Amino acid sequence: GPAWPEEKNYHQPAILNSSALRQIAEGTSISEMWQNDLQPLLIERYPGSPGSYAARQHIMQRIQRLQADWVLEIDTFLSQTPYGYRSFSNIISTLNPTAKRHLVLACHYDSKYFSHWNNRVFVGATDSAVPCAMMLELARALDKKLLSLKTVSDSKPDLSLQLIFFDGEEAFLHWSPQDSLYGSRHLAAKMASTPHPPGARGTSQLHGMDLLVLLDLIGAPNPTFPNFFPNSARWFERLQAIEHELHELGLLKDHSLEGRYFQNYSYGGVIQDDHIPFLRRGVPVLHLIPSPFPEVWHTMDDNEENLDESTIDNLNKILQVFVLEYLHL
Ligand SMILES: [Zn+2]
Ligand SMILES: [Zn+2]
Ligand SMILES: [Zn+2]
Ligand SMILES: [Zn+2]
Ligand SMILES: [Zn+2]
């Protein structure tokens, strides 16, 4: 009904039991993600570079090989930058494009532009090659479950899944209102002015975004994710509960509840990131960015060598469980 944009306010998860939690933990592979999804992305890939094209092709190819009915769209646009007009390309991967509601996971796939120093190149391992690879691994690990979302004569889902890989999150020169968030600013405005579902008189694609889960700066040891917003606080609590359950079942590695990732801790300030253009239009956001930022932030040391594989593996399991429970799969 025309209250369908309010359904997100009443939506509850379908909780997984212990057996299912073990199955999900066993179904993801950090080493396969590392070799097949993460390492091809550990390249210079600022917007418009050859590496940006190679990264986009890799992301699309890894989604395209899956059995689930992903619809891939490239959102290419022109923007002014400190280096003049440039082209950018957001990547969107949607299951059930005409379903009214989607849970949305997102990160940025560009890497910040820097000069090279003594044969060193910035590859943004935490920022955000690892979030990209986590999203690809979730699509792979959950592929057989997500296949059941596919629209047939028997069933068409109200609620499905979408992935967004933003281009141009980073400033080209100096972080500023004109030099930042190129892809997310563009895509939020575009979705805000696109009727959804097709044929709708008065609702946009933005109204169908149940929840935007934004991964950024993930892969360093001991991350702490604050609970940022009152309208996603209850979903933050579900992340806490999932971390705690997986912990008690012995399904996490190198993990203590004293140093857990999702603490009883909120953050009143603003973190400027790709969620802001969505947040400012009323989309609920779960912002999975650590506070403080990793010490390697925007340095040449944000590389593969300094990633913490167990932390990523643990967060893969938590995120996959969260997504299945949200979608009732
Ligand atoms: Zn566009
Ligand atoms: Zn370069
Ligand atoms: Zn960054
Ligand atoms: Zn306990
Ligand atoms: Zn261990």
Coordinates of N, CA, C and O in Angstrom, one line a residue, residues 28 60 79 85 95 119 123 129 154 160 169 242 278 309:
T28 N 31.6 -19.2 4.6 CA 32.5 -18.2 4.1 C 33.9 -18.5 4.2 O 34.3 -19.3 5.1
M60 N 32.3 -6.4 -11.5 CA 31.2 -6.9 -12.3 C 31.4 -8.4 -12.7 O 30.4 -9.1 -12.7
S79 N 31.5 15.4 -13.5 CA 31.5 16.4 -12.5 C 32.7 17.3 -12.6 O 33.8 16.9 -13.1
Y85 N 36.8 19.1 -15.5 CA 35.7 18.1 -15.6 C 36.2 16.7 -15.7 O 37.2 16.5 -16.5
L95 N 19.4 -7.3 -6.8 CA 18.5 -8.4 -6.9 C 17.1 -7.8 -6.9 O 16.7 -6.9 -6.1
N119 N 58.7 4.6 -5.4 CA 58.1 3.3 -5.9 C 56.9 2.9 -5.1 O 56.4 1.7 -5.3
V123 N 47.1 2.1 -2.3 CA 46.1 1.1 -2.8 C 44.9 1.0 -1.9 O 44.0 0.3 -2.2
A129 N 39.3 -1.3 -0.4 CA 39.4 -2.6 -1.1 C 38.8 -3.7 -0.3 O 38.1 -4.6 -0.8
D154 N 5.7 -18.2 -9.2 CA 5.3 -18.7 -7.8 C 5.5 -17.6 -6.8 O 4.8 -17.5 -5.8
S160 N 14.3 -7.0 -1.1 CA 15.5 -7.8 -1.6 C 16.8 -7.0 -1.3 O 16.8 -6.2 -0.4
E169 N 34.6 8.7 -3.9 CA 34.3 9.1 -2.5 C 35.4 10.0 -2.1 O 35.1 11.0 -1.4
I242 N 24.5 -10.5 17.3 CA 25.1 -11.5 16.4 C 26.6 -11.7 16.7 O 27.1 -12.8 16.8
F278 N 22.6 10.4 1.4 CA 21.4 9.6 1.7 C 20.8 10.0 3.1 O 19.6 10.2 3.2
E309 N 43.6 -10.3 9.1 CA 42.7 -11.2 8.4 C 41.6 -11.8 9.3 O 40.4 -12.0 8.8

